């Protein structure tokens, strides 16, 4: 259950992913992947995933808005640490 390092690519469409938590003790979790988008694609990245952070900014603690935010602001190369954390998403 080692947190990996995911390095995408955005597309005209986006990063290919979705993410739900940031509440209530909830981290941020990957929900959906887009199929053929960058997440997709990675080979590195599965719904259950928990973000850890975006281009080093720590995700952990982090608000839904904040987390859409960072994903956004973290431009064409994005390298999210993520983590396989199913029992909790």
């Given at each position: 259950r080692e947190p990996r390092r995911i390095v995408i690519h955005r597309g005209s469409?986006?990063?290919g992913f979705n993410?739900?938590?940031g509440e209530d003790g909830?981290?941020?979790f990957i929900s959906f992947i887009l199929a053929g988008g960058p997440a997709d694609?990675?080979?590195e990245?599965?719904?259950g995933d928990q973000?850890?952070?975006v281009n080093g900014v720590d995700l952990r603690n982090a608000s839904h808005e904040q987390a859409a935010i960072a994903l956004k602001n973290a431009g064409q190369?994005?390298?999210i640490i993520a983590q396989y954390k199913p029992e909790e998403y």
């Open positions: 469409t986006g990063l993410i739900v938590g909830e981290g941020i694609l990675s080979g990245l599965r719904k973000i850890l952070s190369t994005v390298t």
